[PDB]
Design an enzyme around this catalytic site. Sequence first.
Site, PDB file in Angstrom:
ATOM      1  CG  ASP A  34      -2.142   0.965   1.021  1.00 50.41           C
ATOM      2  OD1 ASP A  34      -2.346   1.499  -0.087  1.00 50.41           O
ATOM      3  OD2 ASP A  34      -2.881   1.176   2.009  1.00 50.41           O
ATOM      4  CG  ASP A  90       0.908  -0.859   6.013  1.00 55.12           C
ATOM      5  OD1 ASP A  90      -0.142  -0.256   5.717  1.00 55.12           O
ATOM      6  OD2 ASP A  90       1.067  -2.090   5.826  1.00 55.12           O
ATOM      7  NE  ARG A 122      -3.783   5.308   0.757  1.00 49.08           N
ATOM      8  CZ  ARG A 122      -3.804   5.147  -0.560  1.00 49.08           C
ATOM      9  NH1 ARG A 122      -3.950   6.180  -1.381  1.00 49.08           N
ATOM     10  NH2 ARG A 122      -3.674   3.922  -1.067  1.00 49.08           N
ATOM     11  CG  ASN A 123       0.139   4.075   3.939  1.00 46.01           C
ATOM     12  OD1 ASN A 123      -0.342   4.274   5.055  1.00 46.01           O
ATOM     13  ND2 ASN A 123      -0.367   3.194   3.087  1.00 46.01           N
TER      14      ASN A 123
HETATM   15  C1  LIG Z   1       2.042   3.885  16.036  1.00 47.46           C
HETATM   16  C2  LIG Z   1       2.418   3.278  14.675  1.00 47.46           C
HETATM   17  C3  LIG Z   1       2.618   1.907  14.561  1.00 47.46           C
HETATM   18  C4  LIG Z   1       2.957   1.378  13.324  1.00 47.46           C
HETATM   19  C5  LIG Z   1       3.065   2.220  12.218  1.00 47.46           C
HETATM   20  C6  LIG Z   1       3.469   1.637  10.870  1.00 47.46           C
HETATM   21  O1  LIG Z   1       3.692   2.343   9.940  1.00 47.46           O
HETATM   22  N1  LIG Z   1       3.591   0.196  10.830  1.00 47.46           N
HETATM   23  C7  LIG Z   1       4.024  -0.577   9.679  1.00 47.46           C
HETATM   24  C8  LIG Z   1       3.521  -1.861   9.506  1.00 47.46           C
HETATM   25  C9  LIG Z   1       3.945  -2.626   8.429  1.00 47.46           C
HETATM   26  N2  LIG Z   1       3.390  -3.974   8.319  1.00 47.46           N
HETATM   27  C10 LIG Z   1       4.066  -5.048   7.953  1.00 47.46           C
HETATM   28  C11 LIG Z   1       3.219  -6.123   8.022  1.00 47.46           C
HETATM   29  N3  LIG Z   1       2.046  -5.679   8.459  1.00 47.46           N
HETATM   30  C12 LIG Z   1       2.145  -4.346   8.657  1.00 47.46           C
HETATM   31  C13 LIG Z   1       4.910  -2.128   7.548  1.00 47.46           C
HETATM   32  C14 LIG Z   1       5.428  -0.839   7.732  1.00 47.46           C
HETATM   33  C15 LIG Z   1       6.487  -0.284   6.756  1.00 47.46           C
HETATM   34  F1  LIG Z   1       7.592   0.092   7.455  1.00 47.46           F
HETATM   35  F2  LIG Z   1       6.832  -1.259   5.870  1.00 47.46           F
HETATM   36  F3  LIG Z   1       6.045   0.800   6.066  1.00 47.46           F
HETATM   37  C16 LIG Z   1       4.995  -0.072   8.815  1.00 47.46           C
HETATM   38  C17 LIG Z   1       2.878   3.585  12.321  1.00 47.46           C
HETATM   39  C18 LIG Z   1       2.548   4.103  13.555  1.00 47.46           C
HETATM   40  C19 LIG Z   1       2.331   5.604  13.613  1.00 47.46           C
HETATM   41  C20 LIG Z   1       2.204   6.772  13.569  1.00 47.46           C
HETATM   42  C21 LIG Z   1       2.160   8.287  13.518  1.00 47.46           C
HETATM   43  C22 LIG Z   1       1.015   8.965  13.127  1.00 47.46           C
HETATM   44  N4  LIG Z   1       1.027  10.284  13.108  1.00 47.46           N
HETATM   45  C23 LIG Z   1       2.117  10.940  13.461  1.00 47.46           C
HETATM   46  N5  LIG Z   1       2.069  12.388  13.416  1.00 47.46           N
HETATM   47  C24 LIG Z   1       0.936  13.005  12.730  1.00 47.46           C
HETATM   48  C25 LIG Z   1       0.826  14.518  12.919  1.00 47.46           C
HETATM   49  C26 LIG Z   1      -0.127  13.578  13.670  1.00 47.46           C
HETATM   50  N6  LIG Z   1       3.228  10.342  13.841  1.00 47.46           N
HETATM   51  C27 LIG Z   1       3.283   9.024  13.885  1.00 47.46           C
END
Ligand code: A1H4U
Length: 302
Positions: free
Chosen positions: A163, A181, A167-168
Amino acid sequence: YSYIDPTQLPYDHKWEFPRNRLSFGKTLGAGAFGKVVEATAQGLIKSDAAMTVAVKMLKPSAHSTEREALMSELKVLSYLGNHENIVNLLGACTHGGPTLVITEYCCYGDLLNFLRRKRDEFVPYKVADLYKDFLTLEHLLSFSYQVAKGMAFLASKNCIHRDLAARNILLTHGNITKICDFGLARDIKNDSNYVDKGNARLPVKWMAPESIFNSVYTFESDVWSYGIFLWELFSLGSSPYPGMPVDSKFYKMIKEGFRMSSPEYAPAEMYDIMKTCWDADPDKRPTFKQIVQDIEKQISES
Ligand SMILES: Cc1ccc(C(=O)Nc2cc(-n3ccnc3)cc(C(F)(F)F)c2)cc1C#Cc1cnc(NC2CC2)nc1
Ligand SMILES: [Cl-]
């Protein structure tokens, strides 16, 4: 699962953090089953000083499927380790209650909203006035470079994102991006960028043809999504394929080779990257490593 099974990945217990040391604040985003809340973590630093973090957790609406998905997410993030172009995992809470995933708080929010609120004051060349934080072409090139490096890292760890989209992408100070994500913490039910297809709700306009028609996710399908992401970037936050609903005509036109034209602000060499990312043959698409080398040279000559 694609290449790796997240359930089989280990969870390093060095991440474990006492959940009583978190104070929950405002909800930053929420979907049907999950949410991300701002919180303060006390004793995360060696000094007693409390620091601000973001916490992903499930809602009482969640079922066993979502409970395993969040644990699998934690395993993947722990397995990846820290990397500068990826949102920083800081800790987790796995026993004594529901799964909590603790990351850094990124002050400037998601890249798509950033692009849209900066669009009207975009500067193609030079800023006189520096205090205004005008979005520039230099910033967009750096954004595309950082996201490409982050995806090359994910690829090197055999991780498919599935994804990738503006937005991500989160933003910190200095215009540093972090790939994220948000998954279950995004209300995909009421987000028009996700579309009903079968029994699922998917980001079809970002998806490669092979993914749409037989649910395959590869290194190369992420690269397709990156090309769409570049179009978002250099259109300054516009939705892809504008004025074009997702229907039978859309799938036919994509399968037969229709591709978007260059966005108004895209350098020709960045549009060249978009076209290769959108090659019907996934083997003719570039790798993220190749994209990183391409953009690096563009920035040198800029
Ligand atoms: C708390 C949190 C936990 C987890 C993630 C996250 O991205 N998990 C992720 C998961 C997978 N995945 C793999 C398999 N299943 C899922 C893969 C990836 C990657 F790395 F591959 F992309 C990531 C994000 C946040 C957050 C935030 C946040 C929002 N807002 C602001 N600030 C704004 C102004 C208000 N700051 C922080
Ligand atoms: Cl609920």
